[PDB]
Scaffold this active site. Sequence first.
Site: not given
Ligand SMILES: Cc1cc2nc3c(=O)[nH]c(=O)nc-3n(C[C@H](O)[C@H](O)[C@H](O)COP(=O)(O)OP(=O)(O)OC[C@H]3O[C@@H](n4cnc5c(N)ncnc54)[C@H](O)[C@@H]3O)c2cc1C
Ligand SMILES: COC(=O)c1ccccc1CS(=O)(=O)NC(=O)Nc1nc(OC)cc(OC)n1
Ligand SMILES: Cc1ncc(C[n+]2csc(CCOP(=O)(O)OP(=O)(O)O)c2C)c(N)n1
Lengths: 599, 599
Positions: A119-120
């Site tokens: 992630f990130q």
């Molecule tokens: C603030 C924040 C919170 C998040 N919290 C969550 C959470 O709580 N739960 C959650 O689920 N995610 C969460 N995420 C998102 C997470 O980081 C990933 O983006 C997400 O889990 C990935 O979903 P995915 O594996 O379905 O898709 P992908 O990352 O796109 O992976 C898809 C997989 O399927 C494969 N694939 C693609 N096409 C095909 C095909 N045609 N046939 C077979 N295989 C294929 C790919 O190679 C890949 O391995 C969060 C993101 C943010 C920013």
């Molecule tokens: C930022 O990602 C990480 O540093 C990371 C990535 C891969 C594996 C482990 C980590 C550390 S962590 O699981 O503890 N997450 C974290 O430090 N920050 C964190 N911040 C959020 O909002 C600010 C939301 C969020 O997940 C949606 N994670």
């Molecule tokens: C380009 C970028 N910079 C910094 C971050 C770190 N970051 C993740 S969520 C967040 C806060 C987002 O605030 P907001 O858009 O107001 O959504 P809210 O959580 O308040 O609903 C930040 C700063 C990011 N995901 N992307």
Amino acid sequence: PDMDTSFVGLTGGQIFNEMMSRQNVDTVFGYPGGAILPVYDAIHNSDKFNFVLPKHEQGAGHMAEGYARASGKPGVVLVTSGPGATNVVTPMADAFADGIPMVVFTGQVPTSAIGTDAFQEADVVGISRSCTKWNVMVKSVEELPLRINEAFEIATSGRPGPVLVDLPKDVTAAILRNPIPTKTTLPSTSRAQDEFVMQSINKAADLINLAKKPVLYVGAGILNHADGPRLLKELSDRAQIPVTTTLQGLGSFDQEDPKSLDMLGMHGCATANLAVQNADLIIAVGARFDDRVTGNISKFAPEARRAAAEGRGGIIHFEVSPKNINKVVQTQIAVEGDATTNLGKMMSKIFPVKERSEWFAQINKWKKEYPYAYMEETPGSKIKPQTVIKKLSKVANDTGRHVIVTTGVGQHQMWAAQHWTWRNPHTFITSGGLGTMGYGLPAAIGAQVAKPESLVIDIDGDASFNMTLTELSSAVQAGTPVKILILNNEEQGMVTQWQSLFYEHRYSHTHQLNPDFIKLAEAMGLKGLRVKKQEELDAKLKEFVSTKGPVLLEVEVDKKVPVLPMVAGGSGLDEFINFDPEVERQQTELRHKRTGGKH
Amino acid sequence: PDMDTSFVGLTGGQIFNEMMSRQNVDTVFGYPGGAILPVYDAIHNSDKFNFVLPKHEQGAGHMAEGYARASGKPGVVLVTSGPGATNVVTPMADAFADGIPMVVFTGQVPTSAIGTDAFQEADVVGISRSCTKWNVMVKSVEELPLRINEAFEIATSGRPGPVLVDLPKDVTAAILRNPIPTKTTLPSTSRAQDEFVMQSINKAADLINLAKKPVLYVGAGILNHADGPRLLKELSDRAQIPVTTTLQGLGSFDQEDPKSLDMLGMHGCATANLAVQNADLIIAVGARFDDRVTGNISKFAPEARRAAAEGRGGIIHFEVSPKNINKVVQTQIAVEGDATTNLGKMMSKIFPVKERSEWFAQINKWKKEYPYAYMEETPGSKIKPQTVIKKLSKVANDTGRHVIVTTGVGQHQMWAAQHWTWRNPHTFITSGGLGTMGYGLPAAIGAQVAKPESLVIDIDGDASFNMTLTELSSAVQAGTPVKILILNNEEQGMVTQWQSLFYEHRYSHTHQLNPDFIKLAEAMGLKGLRVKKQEELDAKLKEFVSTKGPVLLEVEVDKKVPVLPMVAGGSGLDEFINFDPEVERQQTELRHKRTGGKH
Ligand SMILES: Cc1cc2nc3c(=O)[nH]c(=O)nc-3n(C[C@H](O)[C@H](O)[C@H](O)COP(=O)(O)OP(=O)(O)OC[C@H]3O[C@@H](n4cnc5c(N)ncnc54)[C@H](O)[C@@H]3O)c2cc1C
Ligand SMILES: COC(=O)c1ccccc1CS(=O)(=O)NC(=O)Nc1nc(OC)cc(OC)n1
Ligand SMILES: Cc1ncc(C[n+]2csc(CCOP(=O)(O)OP(=O)(O)O)c2C)c(N)n1
Ligand SMILES: Cc1cc2nc3c(=O)[nH]c(=O)nc-3n(C[C@H](O)[C@H](O)[C@H](O)COP(=O)(O)OP(=O)(O)OC[C@H]3O[C@@H](n4cnc5c(N)ncnc54)[C@H](O)[C@@H]3O)c2cc1C
Ligand SMILES: COC(=O)c1ccccc1CS(=O)(=O)NC(=O)Nc1nc(OC)cc(OC)n1
Ligand SMILES: Cc1ncc(C[n+]2csc(CCOP(=O)(O)OP(=O)(O)O)c2C)c(N)n1
Ligand SMILES: [Mg+2]
Ligand SMILES: [Mg+2]
Ligand SMILES: [Mg+2]
Ligand SMILES: [Mg+2]
């Protein structure tokens, strides 16, 4: 090695905070996120530095650049992993091209997650390798002071530039549990080399003492030392040598001086270009012979090339980086190292020159023949952008305040360069090598942070301004009373210029739809002013400059106005296109026909 | 022999134009500049495709991603060299992380100038190497059709992703003199492998037919085939298997179906997480076991691991990319290839299940005791952000229109994911892998271009929206009537949540100063609406979606409201923090205490 225990027990984040004061950092530009949280917690409420929060990380980067150009100190950026880091690639590439000292700290996922497509996670060290002087990922807390010290040293020495330091979350959250070498925690010449440099200086003096038509060609390098402009002026006076500067050297030489040739190059004035083409000796000082300066290289400096072939002139290059010596032109004498230091060593070896009557007479004739002419205001006509610059230049100068100008990229940038009267070092802050639109506003904010007492003016284009206009609210939050001028021609003018000239007036996607800039300024918490009429320009410029607090002034200006003179394509520096009012009128009719009346 | 002469006499630019037509491109997103001029000249007034002009190249990139996610077609980006190219690094990394097909064309300086630190030259192939599936620099016009065809093929095959094609100015300005192989101008498995897959399909069917507590764990991969969701629904109905999706799989399964477990993961619902931890068989379909999904990996899926050790279950992985198999978790059976295709081959081998009374009784008990609970409105209280999503969900559905939702990054993104009822594929478009703030608005614009008849809603955060808000005017110029909802909590809410929980309510730089969003919308040429009061909410939401053109609605919502449930740190999926109203009230008092009332 000797060991230091003073950091034992602190987190990486706390060590970061401590190193900032040890590196004399007074300002940090940044934006928080998950991976960089342990560092943000450590700088929470810190009185060690002012923190500036932009709306977008690219803004933090350009702010840091403006801060650096104005202060002489490295700009420090602090952002999170992934998109936080990728959002600063443009400013890093920009700082690299323009030789700007910057230290970029990016959060990174924990070391155990690295290489797992976490992630990130971005491969930031890989991405930024070609656009930093150096980068590194800190792999342990023990290593953190060393890498920080190396980063600051590299960024600020040789040719200054950006460095990136990647900070894994587990490293910044980890507590230091081992003592570390004292050498690593404290910040900060061959004799044959010194003698060799002194030899080259002796030769340079010999060549200069021989020259009948010398020209000083001066760039950003002279500004990397406090005494640069002073020593340049002393050499120019002592040896009676006329001075031209690049875009990036503007301000290094008083343009009120009779020996000033103004700017050379693609859009430089004819006098500077002609002098360079006719000089028997070119003394290049902190300039890199960029393609926007030389024109067609085979046609560049024919008289200096002739002189070199006859052992009586050529090119001398005062250059700090071996990468840039003999990169473009064959150089007769390279004087390696800091230009200012080397000019000081050379000075006493230069024979004082009584006069260069013939050379100066020729130069003065060119000055009379080729001023920066353009189509001036006529009754009912729109305001001319060149006129705005000239008037603002006088209004700003007359305040008596220290004035700093930043710009976007395009025609307005060239007109600012040409029509402003440059007198002071570190007062022109513009994106030259990469030429990044959107630079103007955040650079001005950064510059204002560096110089709170200065009058800071962003002379911007409408399309450039759209790129980063979200930073308006950042200026208000930062308390920086920047003056934003928009020369609004409702076009990407520089691109339409090239389309007019080389693509038969085919304007392909070069007209973006602008927002209402005045309502925008108000929404963002600034005062907004607009001028459309010639008769109101003077009053509005004065109100603009006199306004306390940040202010935006939009000036509606005429459209499809070319920047001239222009040297382009296979043209030599002496083969410029010059302004001609009859030709402008004809091209206008032609344009209306070709665009079907659309433009 | 089989040479093609149809492009002979065309410039590289003109060939580009024709190749877009052959690749069935109907939309190009881009921003012009010097190095890419010959291509812009060639596509001037092109009838081959529509062009969308953003204010910033990052906008072009995110628009192309939105366009791709909504259409199933690759998003095509066309920008200039240098800063034009570096400005698309973030969208490329974003598309790489989320598997989005994108073809990025970047102008480049002439081949002669490459490697000379030329004006607006960046090492774009070097920079973009880690964030593209493949990139290339075109070195001859002869090679241009080939590279374009390869780019589109790679972008859309295997796991879809971004590719970059670098276009030197002399190549695009050059006229093709020579015939080229016909096959290079036309677009676009071992039976051993096919048998090996069939073998794995057979083993996977046996395991499924043996399972007593199975869970379908479904991701974005199922959406990469038109028949994906249909076959998913068929398998679920046939074997009576409950289905949970990732954030990126939302919309692939009807959440109204009794077998829906909703979203799993860090902020997933408790039922989904508990089901996964108690499953004897996890059937992973197009999902990559991201760290945001699994929680503490060593605690992940103990019941499936137990079943694997006794040869009665474990994990089945339908995955297209070999490098994503056995990458995070030990897998009992891997089915390589397109998930949808392989599900079709498996179906007839799956024994139809009558009922799973015990398994579904347990699941329904969890649903009753662990819904998405939160602190609801009270008289005089601020509007709750969860409540806005629920109401908007219903109001949007009542329009009868096809609805597409985009988001920024943060709490609003999670609340959108949780509280909207997802029923249609390709209707949730959010940045998951990289998590790029600012994604919401330009992605919505791109999606609206792909689906002109759909109601497109960007559910955005105040901080996220500030990142790319300049694209508001691009929406007006493009004629895309997107509906922008800002959940304004005047904070980087997601970051403050982490600071509240893990850093003792130390809010380090997470409160950015917002502009007036309504005045901003108006300046940008949009209708602007604001809601503060609970009583106004329903009416304003209705006016919001009923507005003909583009419109922004700001809802002032309560601050410091955590997203729950939450799995973080060393916690397993079953060790989530859940909502409790008394704890929230206690947290409020503690926070006020620690901040002196400031937050
Ligand atoms: C603030 C924040 C919170 C998040 N919290 C969550 C959470 O709580 N739960 C959650 O689920 N995610 C969460 N995420 C998102 C997470 O980081 C990933 O983006 C997400 O889990 C990935 O979903 P995915 O594996 O379905 O898709 P992908 O990352 O796109 O992976 C898809 C997989 O399927 C494969 N694939 C693609 N096409 C095909 C095909 N045609 N046939 C077979 N295989 C294929 C790919 O190679 C890949 O391995 C969060 C993101 C943010 C920013
Ligand atoms: C930022 O990602 C990480 O540093 C990371 C990535 C891969 C594996 C482990 C980590 C550390 S962590 O699981 O503890 N997450 C974290 O430090 N920050 C964190 N911040 C959020 O909002 C600010 C939301 C969020 O997940 C949606 N994670
Ligand atoms: C380009 C970028 N910079 C910094 C971050 C770190 N970051 C993740 S969520 C967040 C806060 C987002 O605030 P907001 O858009 O107001 O959504 P809210 O959580 O308040 O609903 C930040 C700063 C990011 N995901 N992307
Ligand atoms: C639209 C547009 C139009 C342009 N047209 C022009 C034009 O007409 N004229 C023009 O001049 N530019 C023009 N440029 C700018 C051009 O691209 C370059 O950015 C600029 O010419 C570089 O100037 P410079 O060599 O002085 O600075 P730099 O690129 O920063 O080079 C400085 C040189 O000095 C060296 N140096 C640094 N420090 C020291 C030191 N302490 N001692 C000794 N040497 C040192 C450096 O290593 C480097 O070699 C234009 C840009 C744009 C965007
Ligand atoms: C983008 O730079 C080039 O492609 C380049 C770079 C190094 C060497 C040669 C070139 C080609 S070029 O000299 O002919 N310039 C050009 O194609 N475009 C061009 N566009 C401008 O604004 C639209 C302004 C401008 O110089 C300030 N150059
Ligand atoms: C980020 C970026 N994208 C594209 C370009 C190409 N480009 C150079 S100048 C210019 C037009 C600038 O228009 P404007 O800011 O309004 O200034 P004007 O020439 O009209 O005075 C463009 C699009 C660039 N330099 N930077
Ligand atoms: Mg001048
Ligand atoms: Mg303009
Ligand atoms: Mg739901
Ligand atoms: Mg917020």
